[PDB]
Design a protein around this nucleic acid. Structure first.
Ligand SMILES: [Zn+2]
Ligand SMILES: [Zn+2]
Ligand SMILES: [Zn+2]
Ligand SMILES: [Zn+2]
Lengths: 95, 85, 96, 86
DNA sequence: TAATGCAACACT
DNA sequence: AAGTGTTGCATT
């Protein structure tokens, strides 16, 4: 049961900003997101807002990432590397 | 704050809601203003000039009902007023 | 094992390529042939690709150095063509 | 018609012959003029500013040996004359 | 979901 | 083989 509004992937570029610390995310770096409406551009509007894996877990509660779900339930998680999969599994445990 | 809007495609990334095709970077596009269940505001539904009147849009007087009408060229303003008649 | 190296065939990746057999543009998707030769007006690039319409090509088969020995099936990238296109070139570029 | 040439990359499609990496659209590139068996003429072998002196090329007076030396920002031609003896 | 920036392809 | 022109990505 993979979540629909929570995805994980490698930074397709270095011009995406982490909305958890407001600093750029280097390309290739692992990044998480939640499918939510951007208050500054709601006319899109339900898009992707990215965070560093650390910045994400730091706001797990406020982002609505219930303790019920785990890292393995992330959309696009299957397309990650092994050292990256297990890295998120320890940062986003289930229950 | 009108029901309709018309202008020259600010960009070629727009897409007709009828044929689902792209719209040229300067083509004549007409949109229908619809409510957005995501932030409580109007959002443009762009169509091709031909695709617009295809989805049924009986407009009496475009000059007032359509927003930004007085910005277009007289040649098109009448081509719209005629197509609407 | 028998495919030519300096003669290739493919579908026009764009509509901005010019046929050097008639000097008019080749529409995208259209089948096009080429010869790995050095463009005289840009020799610095060395051996590249100069494209022709399938018809414009066969019209200059001799001058382009496409010996009667070879056939259309020996074209580089020929295997990646459609059936109706393969056989179309086979009748235009017969072997011996 | 000089042995060397220097300029600001007229495009970012150039490639260093040393590290085989791309060159920025305005980076300082230096090439070595070599004979071409294609059209009877010289052809540029572009390098990165750092990659250039790496292939082992000692230039005494760049201002004259290098073509287009006088045709660039003052700030650069001094940097060229500096790293020249080094 | 369409308006910027960018980055990469296609031709030569 | 590197400039030019174009198309398509990526982020919002
Ligand atoms: Zn962050
Ligand atoms: Zn349409
Ligand atoms: Zn032709
Ligand atoms: Zn280099």
């Amino acid at each position: 049961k993979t979540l629909g509004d929570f995805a994980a992937e490698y930074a397709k570029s270095n011009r995406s900003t982490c909305k958890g610390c407001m600093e750029k995310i280097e390309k290739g770096q692992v990044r998480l997101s939640k499918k939510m409406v951007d208050p500054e551009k709601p006319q899109l509007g339900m898009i992707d807002r990215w965070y560093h894996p650390g910045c994400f877990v730091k706001n797990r509660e406020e982002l609505g990432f219930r303790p019920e779900y785990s890292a393995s339930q992330l959309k696009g998680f299957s397309l990650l590397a092994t050292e990256d999969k297990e890295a998120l599994k320890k940062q986003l445990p289930g229950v | 704050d009108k029901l309709y809007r018309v202008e020259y495609a600010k960009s070629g990334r727009a897409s007709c809601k009828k044929c689902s095709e792209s719209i040229p970077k300067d083509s004549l596009r007409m949109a229908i203003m619809v409510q957005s269940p995501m932030f409580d505001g109007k959002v443009p539904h762009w169509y091709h000039f031909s695709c617009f009147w295809k989805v049924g849009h009986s407009i009496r007087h475009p000059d007032v009902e359509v927003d930004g009408f007085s910005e277009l060229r007289w040649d098109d303003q009448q081509k719209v007023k005629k197509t609407a008649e």
